[PDB]
Design a protein around this nucleic acid. Sequence first.
RNA 1: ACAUAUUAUUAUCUUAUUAUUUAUAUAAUAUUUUUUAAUAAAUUUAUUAAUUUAUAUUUAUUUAUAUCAGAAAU
RNA 2: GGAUUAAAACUAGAGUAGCGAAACGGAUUCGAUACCCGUGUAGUUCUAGUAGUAAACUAUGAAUACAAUUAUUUAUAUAUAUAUAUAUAAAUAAUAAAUGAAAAUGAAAGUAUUCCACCUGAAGAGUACGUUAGCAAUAAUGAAACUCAAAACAAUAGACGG
RNA 3: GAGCGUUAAUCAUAAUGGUUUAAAGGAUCCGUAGAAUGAAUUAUAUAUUAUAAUUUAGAGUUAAUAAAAUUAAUUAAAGAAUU
RNA 4: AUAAGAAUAUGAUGUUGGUUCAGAUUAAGCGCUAAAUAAGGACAUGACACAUGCGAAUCAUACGUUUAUUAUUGAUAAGAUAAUAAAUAUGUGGUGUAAACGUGAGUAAUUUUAUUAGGAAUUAAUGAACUAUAGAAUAAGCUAAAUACUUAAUAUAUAAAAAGGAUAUAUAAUAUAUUUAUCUAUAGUCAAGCCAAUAAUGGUUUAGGUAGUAGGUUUAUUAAGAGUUAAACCUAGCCAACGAUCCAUAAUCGAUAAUGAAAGUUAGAACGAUCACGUUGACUCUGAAAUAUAGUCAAUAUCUAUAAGAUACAGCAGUGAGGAAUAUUGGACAAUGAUCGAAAGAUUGAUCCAGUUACUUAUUAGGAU
Lengths: 235, 53
Amino acid sequence: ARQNFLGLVVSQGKMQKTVKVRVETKVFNKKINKELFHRRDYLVHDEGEISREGDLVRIEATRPLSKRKFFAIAEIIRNKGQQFALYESEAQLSVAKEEAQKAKEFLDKRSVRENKLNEKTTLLRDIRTIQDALSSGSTPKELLEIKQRYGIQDFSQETVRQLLQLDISGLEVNLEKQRSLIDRIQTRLSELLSNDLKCDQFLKDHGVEDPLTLKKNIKKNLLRKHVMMDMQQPS
Amino acid sequence: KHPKGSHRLSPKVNFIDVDNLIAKTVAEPQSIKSSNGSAQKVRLQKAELRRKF
RNA sequence: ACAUAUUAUUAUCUUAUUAUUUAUAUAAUAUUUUUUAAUAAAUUUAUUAAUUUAUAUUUAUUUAUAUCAGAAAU
RNA sequence: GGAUUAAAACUAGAGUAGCGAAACGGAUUCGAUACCCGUGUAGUUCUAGUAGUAAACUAUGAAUACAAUUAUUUAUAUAUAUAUAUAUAAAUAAUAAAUGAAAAUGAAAGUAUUCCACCUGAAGAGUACGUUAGCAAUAAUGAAACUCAAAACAAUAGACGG
RNA sequence: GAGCGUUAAUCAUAAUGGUUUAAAGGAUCCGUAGAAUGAAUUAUAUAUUAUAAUUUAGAGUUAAUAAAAUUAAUUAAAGAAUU
RNA sequence: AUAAGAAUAUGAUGUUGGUUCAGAUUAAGCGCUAAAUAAGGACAUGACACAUGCGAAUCAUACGUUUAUUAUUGAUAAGAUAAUAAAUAUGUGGUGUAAACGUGAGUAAUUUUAUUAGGAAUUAAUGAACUAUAGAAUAAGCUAAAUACUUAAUAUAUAAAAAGGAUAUAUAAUAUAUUUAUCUAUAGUCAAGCCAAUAAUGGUUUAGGUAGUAGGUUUAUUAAGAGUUAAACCUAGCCAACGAUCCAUAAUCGAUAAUGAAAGUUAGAACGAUCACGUUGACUCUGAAAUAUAGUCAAUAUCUAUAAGAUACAGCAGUGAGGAAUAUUGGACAAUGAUCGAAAGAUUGAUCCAGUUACUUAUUAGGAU
Ligand SMILES: [K+]
Ligand SMILES: [K+]
Ligand SMILES: [K+]
Ligand SMILES: [K+]
Ligand SMILES: [K+]
Ligand SMILES: [K+]
Ligand SMILES: [K+]
Ligand SMILES: [K+]
Ligand SMILES: [K+]
Ligand SMILES: [K+]
Ligand SMILES: [K+]
Ligand SMILES: [K+]
Ligand SMILES: [K+]
Ligand SMILES: [K+]
Ligand SMILES: [K+]
Ligand SMILES: [Mg+2]
Ligand SMILES: [Mg+2]
Ligand SMILES: [Mg+2]
Ligand SMILES: [Mg+2]
Ligand SMILES: [Mg+2]
Ligand SMILES: [Mg+2]
Ligand SMILES: [Mg+2]
Ligand SMILES: [Mg+2]
Ligand SMILES: [Mg+2]
Ligand SMILES: [Mg+2]
Ligand SMILES: [Mg+2]
Ligand SMILES: [Mg+2]
Ligand SMILES: [Mg+2]
Ligand SMILES: [Mg+2]
Ligand SMILES: [Mg+2]
Ligand SMILES: [Mg+2]
Ligand SMILES: [Mg+2]
Ligand SMILES: [Mg+2]
Ligand SMILES: [Mg+2]
Ligand SMILES: [Mg+2]
Ligand SMILES: [Mg+2]
Ligand SMILES: [Mg+2]
Ligand SMILES: [Mg+2]
Ligand SMILES: [Mg+2]
Ligand SMILES: [Mg+2]
Ligand SMILES: [Mg+2]
Ligand SMILES: [Mg+2]
Ligand SMILES: [Mg+2]
Ligand SMILES: [Mg+2]
Ligand SMILES: [Mg+2]
Ligand SMILES: [Mg+2]
Ligand SMILES: [Mg+2]
Ligand SMILES: [Mg+2]
Ligand SMILES: [Mg+2]
Ligand SMILES: [Mg+2]
Ligand SMILES: [Mg+2]
Ligand SMILES: [Mg+2]
Ligand SMILES: [Mg+2]
Ligand SMILES: [Mg+2]
Ligand SMILES: [Mg+2]
Ligand SMILES: [Mg+2]
Ligand SMILES: [Mg+2]
Ligand SMILES: [Mg+2]
Ligand SMILES: [Mg+2]
């Protein structure tokens, strides 16, 4: 049949309807006693100009098409070259949109900081008026303004404590919950495995059919999936 | 797309029908001609042997 | 340095021959075509030599391109 | 392919104490274009460049896996009845094995794997010619003919040593 | 041995090699090609290769903690001595 | 599967390292020597120049021409006609020389070689010349005549042909029969064109090369693809340090020869395969295929007939030259082939034999006492 080769497109878009395909064949080199790969570039006809540099293609022998062209593209085995072209175009649009959004979020942050620098009022001073007015009874209009600078309509001892909350405090509680879950899951499964009877019951209670007839790994995974379905779904 | 001016498929294999090959190559004389001549008889004998072979 | 021989090349010069392509002929031949003499046969027809007519095939000269080779330069 | 690359050298402009090619003198010597002494120019210094060469040496390319010990430092860690002790790496020193022409190497110059550079008698010769690069000195690349049966390394025993 | 010798030639006769010290490590590193080489498991395939998925022992990124004050370039200073 | 080393360093030793030797061989030469026979080889050099003879002829059953005899005709013999038997290849024709033979100049590959269970454009109304089968073979002209040539007729969009001769018999030139030729068609056989992939010496101290160059589109040309060639219009490519381009050198190869344990290396004389060439260059004709050992023109040399002449020994033998060196100016067509012829036969320096030469191989070249 017509001789067919597999190769990588190494040049495209330089000649009209012609691409350069790199074909590697296996040969034996008697001198060094080693089976080597021999490489050669073929000028190949691309009637539809579909192939792109980087594509893996199969080329088939044809009639003479030019001084040096004797093969044509017969199939695109892998289209990595075509993908590269599509992803580059999308990237230009995708990145422009993201950069525009980030540029607008940077100018907004700058405006807020500038606005705050125009308000001579300082947190300490404001928190020293909400704690003196709340301990003296005075209600100068500054407080009403302060009830707008911060949005704190009510001036109580439990409102300054909520104006000065630090994110670290929330992190400390989320970390304890995370540690609890891990510790509970491990103790639960550890105990369950220690007692085969309580383990068999555990599986049946959660909806396993004849858990007794199961393997150690085929069933410990069920136990693990259940212990993690009784401490993460209920919570 | 295959190259313009080229056949997309390979030419169909030509299978020989031996009955048709024999009929066209070594066809039998259509009539039993009168080979009274000495040279006609020799030619008839040679043609028969060649066709048999 | 150089004096030699050999080969290759060319925006050059000359060029046999050939191919291709131009223009021209009161060009030749055949046929057609228009007439015209001479001759012959018969009692218009044929032949030959001319002229007119187109057609095909050649010929001579001519235009352009390429070309063995030689010259010059490298 | 690229970059960096001692000393000397060169281009331009500053600097110039000391040192110091050269040069000119003083000695030494049979002679002394030397060793020693004097006067001491370039250079040695700085700035901006050129150039890409050294015994540019561990005369030992880089990477990975692996193999028997001791000693000494360093680092990290651990413990305590708190200052040592116990660990794990690195460095260095001396070694086993192994390797090697031996001298020796010793975690490689061992056991293996991968990649690069390089060599094929001496002399001619890192020369000639050409080319490339540089302001230049030069640097890179790099032969052949002729001639010879040499030539070289480690080690051994001597002889000799101002 | 009807040849023998000689000259001219061909093949064989050590790489089942080497490069600290004998010919031979590039001054050094960076890095391109390499038709150079190079991890693990499983499944396919047309099979020491290809593809897909999965993995972290090589190679990297960031941070935390501890440690160190060297090496480049630049700028600003000090010191003994010499003439 | 078959793998050996030796001499030479050094005061001595170990090692590095070259040199030389022991083996086989030749397209061999030379020195000395030499018996017969059988077989295999023989200008590697100047693709230098060549005296002389040969190497390609054959057909009389294509046409024509020339004799003799006999018969008939011709009232005198010049001729004619037919039969018979001869002659003619200095007239017109047919077929044969694209092979074979010789040589290795050119050729490093758009061309050449080798290989592949390769390919398409998806190769002509090509048969070259045999086989099988079927059909056809007509009319004029031109020449002295024809199987010469020319123009027509009819034969698979349809296109595209031809030829008679010899011998008998019967007729009144014609017809049959036999024999040998001619043309067309179909298939077979033999045999052609083109392309791909892979391999094929040295120098980069030849590093850049290319400009129809790389690709696209269209026409012309061809049986047929393609910057293969010619014309036009576009794109800016293509090759290259895994060596481009350039230069030098060389015919290539094997189931051939030599060598080695082998991988290999060498040769390419001999045997065989392939290519190229026939003093040099280009071009054209015929043809399926030729830049043909043809033709045309030119170049170089020679010759005689002095013409827009002939010849070119790389066919055989042979000669001079060159060189260390390579042979008979032999016999025969008996054999195997080739060409012409219907046959009888003719031709054949293909070929087969012999000669010369230890160039190679083999056998023999007296045993017992
Ligand atoms: K084309
Ligand atoms: K100074
Ligand atoms: K050193
Ligand atoms: K290296
Ligand atoms: K060594
Ligand atoms: K000696
Ligand atoms: K030796
Ligand atoms: K001899
Ligand atoms: K005849
Ligand atoms: K000959
Ligand atoms: K040749
Ligand atoms: K007949
Ligand atoms: K080259
Ligand atoms: K010969
Ligand atoms: K014969
Ligand atoms: Mg001209
Ligand atoms: Mg010319
Ligand atoms: Mg200066
Ligand atoms: Mg001095
Ligand atoms: Mg520099
Ligand atoms: Mg130097
Ligand atoms: Mg050096
Ligand atoms: Mg140093
Ligand atoms: Mg590294
Ligand atoms: Mg130099
Ligand atoms: Mg020594
Ligand atoms: Mg003998
Ligand atoms: Mg060997
Ligand atoms: Mg090494
Ligand atoms: Mg080094
Ligand atoms: Mg060195
Ligand atoms: Mg890591
Ligand atoms: Mg010997
Ligand atoms: Mg003989
Ligand atoms: Mg010869
Ligand atoms: Mg006759
Ligand atoms: Mg004749
Ligand atoms: Mg021939
Ligand atoms: Mg007729
Ligand atoms: Mg006639
Ligand atoms: Mg004819
Ligand atoms: Mg005709
Ligand atoms: Mg017709
Ligand atoms: Mg040179
Ligand atoms: Mg074309
Ligand atoms: Mg071309
Ligand atoms: Mg053109
Ligand atoms: Mg030659
Ligand atoms: Mg060979
Ligand atoms: Mg031969
Ligand atoms: Mg050869
Ligand atoms: Mg011969
Ligand atoms: Mg020829
Ligand atoms: Mg010629
Ligand atoms: Mg000729
Ligand atoms: Mg000749
Ligand atoms: Mg001869
Ligand atoms: Mg002589
Ligand atoms: Mg003869």
